[PDB]
Amino acid sequence: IVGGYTCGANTVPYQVSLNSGYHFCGGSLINSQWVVSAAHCYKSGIQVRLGEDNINVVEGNEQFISASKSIVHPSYNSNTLNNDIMLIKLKSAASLNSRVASISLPTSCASAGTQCLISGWGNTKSSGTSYPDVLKCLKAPILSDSSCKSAYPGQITSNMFCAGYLEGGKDSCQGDSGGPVVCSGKLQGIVSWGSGCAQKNKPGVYTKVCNYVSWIKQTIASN
Numbered sequence: 001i002v003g004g005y006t007c008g009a010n011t012v013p014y015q016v017s018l019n020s021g022y023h024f025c026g027g028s029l030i031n032s033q034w035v036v037s038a039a040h041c042y043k044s045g046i047q048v049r050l051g052e053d054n055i056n057v058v059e060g061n062e063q064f065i066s067a068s069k070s071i072v073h074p075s076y077n078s079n080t081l082n083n084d085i086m087l088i089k090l091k092s093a094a095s096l097n098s099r100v101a102s103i104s105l106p107t108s109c110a111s112a113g114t115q116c117l118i119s120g121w122g123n124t125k126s127s128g129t130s131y132p133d134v135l136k137c138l139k140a141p142i143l144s145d146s147s148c149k150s151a152y153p154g155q156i157t158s159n160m161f162c163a164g165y166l167e168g169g170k171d172s173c174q175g176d177s178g179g180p181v182v183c184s185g186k187l188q189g190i191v192s193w194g195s196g197c198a199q200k201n202k203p204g205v206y207t208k209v210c211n212y213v214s215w216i217k218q219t220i221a222s223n
């Protein structure tokens with residue numbers, strides 16, 4: 001997260017870190033045994049880490065649970081990043097409390113202008129590299145689809161939305177992928193892609209979760 005702030009330990013209870021020997025992507029806990037992340041974050045041998053603040057120090061509220069299965073969206077295209085969403089099932093159900101909680105799926109799609117909270121353990125610099133050990137947060141508005149399309153000609157599908165600032169300076173970045181974009185307590189997006197990070201006129205592009213509620217619900221009901 002570039003140009004954000006330190007969240008505060010366990011203040012984003014649904015934020016999870018996907019670990020395969022190291023943190024490689026974020027995710028959002030949607031119920032005691034399912035996590036939603038980005039399809040581009042797919043890899044075998046995932047251990048889901050919940051209750052995390054400093055990902056490099058065991059501080060006492062963590063729950064490390066291996067994934068039993070991952071389900072990449074059936075129409076995911078890795079070249080265009082269309083349908084960049086994936087479900088991960090935990091081997092055992094997480095113990096839910098104030099610090100570890102699920103985030104609700106949306107009942108409606110959020111509109112341009114809606115303020116959201118984006119979080120993650122990704123790079124904090126737009127040029128160069130610096131990884132924070134504690135969770136970073138960023139309050140950012142969803143941008144209009146026209147400004148989104150104008151920013152990325154021929155690349156924005158109906159399953160994507162831009163969020164951020166055209167001025168640059170504030171955005172998600174490498175290491176934040178798969179993480180949450182929450183608006184009014186509902187998971188509206190997944191950190192997907194962008195050109196570099198926090199660059200002028202290159203806002204973050206997010207998977208439009210509201211388009212996938214039926215798929216998520218049906219997939220969970222049968223797996």
Ligand SMILES: *C(=O)[C@H](CCCNC(=N)N)[C@H](NC(=O)N1CCN(C(=O)NC(C)(C)C)CC1)C(=O)O
Pocket residue numbers: 024025040041042043122171172173174175176177178191192193194195196197198203204205
């Ligand atoms: C996500 O972290 C990156 C995009 C963030 C959004 N950018 C922005 N708003 N301007 C994404 N990098 C990324 O997710 N990858 C793939 C998964 N990781 C990994 O360890 N790779 C394996 C092959 C799975 C081992 C981290 C790097 C990006 O740069 O597009």
Ligand SMILES: [Ca+2]
Pocket residue numbers: 052053054055056057058059062
């Ligand atoms: Ca920790």
